[PDB]
Design an enzyme around this catalytic site. Structure first.
Site, PDB file in Angstrom:
ATOM      1  N   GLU A  40       2.910   1.901  10.743  1.00 39.64           N
ATOM      2  CA  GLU A  40       4.370   1.845  10.887  1.00 39.64           C
ATOM      3  C   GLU A  40       4.907   0.439  10.593  1.00 39.64           C
ATOM      4  O   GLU A  40       5.928   0.296   9.953  1.00 39.64           O
ATOM      5  CB  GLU A  40       4.757   2.230  12.322  1.00 39.64           C
ATOM      6  CG  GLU A  40       4.855   3.704  12.584  1.00 39.64           C
ATOM      7  CD  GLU A  40       5.200   3.955  14.049  1.00 39.64           C
ATOM      8  OE1 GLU A  40       4.437   3.464  14.921  1.00 39.64           O
ATOM      9  OE2 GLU A  40       6.255   4.596  14.333  1.00 39.64           O
ATOM     10  N   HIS A  47      10.403  -1.587   4.007  1.00 39.14           N
ATOM     11  CA  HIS A  47      11.789  -1.137   4.221  1.00 39.14           C
ATOM     12  C   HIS A  47      12.732  -2.286   4.579  1.00 39.14           C
ATOM     13  O   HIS A  47      13.938  -2.190   4.335  1.00 39.14           O
ATOM     14  CB  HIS A  47      11.823  -0.021   5.260  1.00 39.14           C
ATOM     15  CG  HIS A  47      11.263   1.278   4.735  1.00 39.14           C
ATOM     16  ND1 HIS A  47      11.963   2.464   4.792  1.00 39.14           N
ATOM     17  CD2 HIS A  47      10.102   1.558   4.095  1.00 39.14           C
ATOM     18  CE1 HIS A  47      11.247   3.425   4.234  1.00 39.14           C
ATOM     19  NE2 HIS A  47      10.118   2.897   3.790  1.00 39.14           N
ATOM     20  N   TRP A 164       0.053  -1.807  -7.282  1.00 43.31           N
ATOM     21  CA  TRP A 164      -0.598  -2.718  -6.347  1.00 43.31           C
ATOM     22  C   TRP A 164      -0.121  -2.573  -4.907  1.00 43.31           C
ATOM     23  O   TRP A 164      -0.953  -2.466  -3.975  1.00 43.31           O
ATOM     24  CB  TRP A 164      -0.496  -4.172  -6.827  1.00 43.31           C
ATOM     25  CG  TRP A 164      -1.070  -4.352  -8.216  1.00 43.31           C
ATOM     26  CD1 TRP A 164      -1.945  -3.502  -8.884  1.00 43.31           C
ATOM     27  CD2 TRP A 164      -0.857  -5.460  -9.083  1.00 43.31           C
ATOM     28  NE1 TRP A 164      -2.277  -4.031 -10.111  1.00 43.31           N
ATOM     29  CE2 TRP A 164      -1.613  -5.223 -10.269  1.00 43.31           C
ATOM     30  CE3 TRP A 164      -0.075  -6.632  -8.989  1.00 43.31           C
ATOM     31  CZ2 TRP A 164      -1.603  -6.103 -11.353  1.00 43.31           C
ATOM     32  CZ3 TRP A 164      -0.082  -7.525 -10.073  1.00 43.31           C
ATOM     33  CH2 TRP A 164      -0.832  -7.247 -11.244  1.00 43.31           C
TER      34      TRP A 164
HETATM   35  C1  HEM Z   1       7.368   2.695  -4.116  1.00 41.10           C
HETATM   36  C2  HEM Z   1       7.712   3.901  -3.679  1.00 41.10           C
HETATM   37  C3  HEM Z   1       7.363   4.440  -2.279  1.00 41.10           C
HETATM   38  C4  HEM Z   1       7.702   5.668  -1.819  1.00 41.10           C
HETATM   39  C5  HEM Z   1       8.449   6.793  -2.562  1.00 41.10           C
HETATM   40  C6  HEM Z   1       7.169   5.794  -0.494  1.00 41.10           C
HETATM   41  C7  HEM Z   1       7.305   6.888   0.334  1.00 41.10           C
HETATM   42  C8  HEM Z   1       6.762   6.994   1.615  1.00 41.10           C
HETATM   43  C9  HEM Z   1       6.898   8.150   2.453  1.00 41.10           C
HETATM   44  C10 HEM Z   1       7.678   9.439   2.082  1.00 41.10           C
HETATM   45  C11 HEM Z   1       6.245   7.920   3.598  1.00 41.10           C
HETATM   46  C12 HEM Z   1       6.137   8.905   4.768  1.00 41.10           C
HETATM   47  C13 HEM Z   1       7.293   8.697   5.747  1.00 41.10           C
HETATM   48  C14 HEM Z   1       7.268   9.780   6.808  1.00 41.10           C
HETATM   49  O1  HEM Z   1       7.570  10.961   6.469  1.00 41.10           O
HETATM   50  O2  HEM Z   1       6.923   9.474   7.973  1.00 41.10           O
HETATM   51  C15 HEM Z   1       5.652   6.601   3.533  1.00 41.10           C
HETATM   52  C16 HEM Z   1       4.901   6.027   4.531  1.00 41.10           C
HETATM   53  C17 HEM Z   1       4.304   4.790   4.472  1.00 41.10           C
HETATM   54  N1  HEM Z   1       4.602   3.824   3.530  1.00 41.10           N
HETATM   55 FE1  HEM Z   1       5.333   4.287   1.521  1.00 41.10          FE
HETATM   56  N2  HEM Z   1       6.533   4.596  -0.182  1.00 41.10           N
HETATM   57  C18 HEM Z   1       6.640   3.725  -1.246  1.00 41.10           C
HETATM   58  C19 HEM Z   1       6.138   2.423  -1.266  1.00 41.10           C
HETATM   59  C20 HEM Z   1       5.550   1.748  -0.205  1.00 41.10           C
HETATM   60  C21 HEM Z   1       5.208   0.341  -0.174  1.00 41.10           C
HETATM   61  C22 HEM Z   1       5.526  -0.627  -1.338  1.00 41.10           C
HETATM   62  C23 HEM Z   1       4.620   0.055   0.988  1.00 41.10           C
HETATM   63  C24 HEM Z   1       4.068  -1.371   1.368  1.00 41.10           C
HETATM   64  C25 HEM Z   1       4.136  -1.790   2.615  1.00 41.10           C
HETATM   65  C26 HEM Z   1       4.516   1.320   1.735  1.00 41.10           C
HETATM   66  C27 HEM Z   1       3.940   1.518   2.993  1.00 41.10           C
HETATM   67  C28 HEM Z   1       3.851   2.658   3.726  1.00 41.10           C
HETATM   68  C29 HEM Z   1       2.988   2.870   4.841  1.00 41.10           C
HETATM   69  C30 HEM Z   1       1.955   1.893   5.431  1.00 41.10           C
HETATM   70  C31 HEM Z   1       3.295   4.268   5.351  1.00 41.10           C
HETATM   71  C32 HEM Z   1       2.609   4.937   6.564  1.00 41.10           C
HETATM   72  C33 HEM Z   1       3.577   4.925   7.714  1.00 41.10           C
HETATM   73  C34 HEM Z   1       2.946   5.491   8.977  1.00 41.10           C
HETATM   74  O3  HEM Z   1       1.847   6.113   8.922  1.00 41.10           O
HETATM   75  O4  HEM Z   1       3.546   5.298  10.071  1.00 41.10           O
HETATM   76  N3  HEM Z   1       5.106   2.314   0.980  1.00 41.10           N
HETATM   77  N4  HEM Z   1       6.014   6.046   2.315  1.00 41.10           N
END
Ligand code: HEM
Ligand code: CA
Ligand code: CA
Length: 317
Positions: A40, A47, A164
């Site tokens: 998170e 974000h 990356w």
């Molecule tokens: C670039 C396009 C990206 C899209 C479309 C995307 C989309 C998402 C989505 C839909 C989730 C799930 C949210 C939920 O339903 O709870 C998620 C979770 C997550 N995102 Fe991405 N993301 C992107 C890039 C990134 C980047 C650049 C990071 C770098 C920090 C990142 C880190 C994470 C992490 C660590 C989770 C897990 C959250 C959890 O388990 O609590 N994301 N993201």
């Protein structure tokens, strides 16, 4: 420099981080685990930072997602982020670092708890945010590759750097994509920072792990895994596919690129020459032990090879 408790850091200004480190390991990350809270907090770094647009404004990695949570957690792409914002805010109030420093520090400390992980470079001294992020600056899993790349590009990331950064999805789950199955991970090893995410996203979609009609969700290759449509497409798009595959069984490249590009992201809206390097405060991550693999019983015929230049590597299963 030697801090008051005898721990050492290259720059003395960094000593204030050590009680904060102890506090978050114990009280944010539940005894330094690589679990939900870490995941998170890593999502929070993005974000917060991605709220940065040359034409519209936003201070990037500035703490605005906590300072102006009333605004930013109203944005649809910030669904579910309120939980970690609420968990982090008392730490910010208690200690004496800016919200922008805290978010990046907490994300780096968190990643350091994950086997295979890296120490993300960390700089101290971001001023308090002075503006909320503009709306509609956060990529969504139902956005096209072109739209994601254009957004990320506008914030200063090339298509390879988007790949990356998405190494983050190696230690990641979804709660809102399909709310019938919260905590379903993006890869088979959500507590391990490894290449499994890049392998498993390349597999043929087979099923939906929960319900079948969710916006932004692709068929997953496994019952216990969820696939975002954005990851599905990026793994396959001519713009990003060869770079995506380049990470498979290539943990050294994952480590190098993720640390460097996370550092660039942590510094969006900032000037590192005005900040103090406190990278040595980050704990040493554990290393990997087990080799990269196709899931057991899967073979190369299950992989949707998308790099014309280079065949998908021969992995055992
Ligand atoms: C670039 C396009 C990206 C899209 C479309 C995307 C989309 C998402 C989505 C839909 C989730 C799930 C949210 C939920 O339903 O709870 C998620 C979770 C997550 N995102 Fe991405 N993301 C992107 C890039 C990134 C980047 C650049 C990071 C770098 C920090 C990142 C880190 C994470 C992490 C660590 C989770 C897990 C959250 C959890 O388990 O609590 N994301 N993201
Ligand atoms: Ca921000
Ligand atoms: Ca993983």
């Amino acid at each position: 420099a030697t801090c008051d408790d005898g721990r050492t850091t290259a720059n003395a200004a960094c000593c204030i981080l050590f009680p904060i480190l102890d506090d978050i390991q114990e009280n944010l990350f539940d005894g330094a685990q690589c679990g939900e809270e870490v995941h998170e907090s890593l999502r929070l770094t993005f974000h917060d930072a991605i709220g940065f647009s040359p034409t519209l404004g936003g201070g990037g990695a500035d703490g605005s997602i906590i300072a102006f949570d009333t605004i930013e957690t109203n944005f649809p792409a910030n669904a579910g982020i309120d939980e970690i914002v609420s968990a982090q805010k008392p730490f910010v109030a208690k200690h004496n670092i800016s919200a922008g420093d805290f978010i990046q520090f907490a994300g780096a400390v968190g990643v350091s708890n994950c086997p295979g992980g890296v120490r993300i470079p960390f700089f101290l001294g971001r001023p308090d945010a002075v503006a909320a992020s503009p709306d509609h600056l956060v990529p969504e899993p139902f956005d096209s590759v072109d739209s994601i790349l254009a957004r990320m590009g506008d914030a200063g990331f090339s298509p390879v750097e988007v790949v990356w950064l998405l190494a983050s999805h190696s230690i990641a789950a979804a709660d809102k994509v399909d709310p019938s199955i919260p905590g379903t991970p993006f890869d088979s090893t959500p507590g391990v920072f490894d290449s499994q995410f890049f392998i498993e996203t390349q597999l043929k979609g087979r099923l939906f792990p929960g319900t079948a009609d969710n916006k932004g969700e692709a068929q997953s290759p496994l019952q216990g895994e969820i696939r975002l449509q954005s990851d599905h497409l990026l793994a396959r798009d001519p713009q990003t596919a060869c770079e995506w595959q380049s990470f498979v069984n290539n943990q050294p490249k994952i480590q190098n690129r993720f640390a460097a590009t996370m550092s660039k992201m942590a510094l969006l809206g900032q000037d590192k020459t005005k900040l103090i390097d406190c990278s040595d405060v980050i704990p040493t991550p554990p290393a990997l032990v087990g080799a990269a693999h196709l899931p057991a019983g899967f073979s190369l015929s299950d992989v949707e090879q998308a790099c014309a230049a280079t065949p998908f590597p021969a992995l055992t299963a």
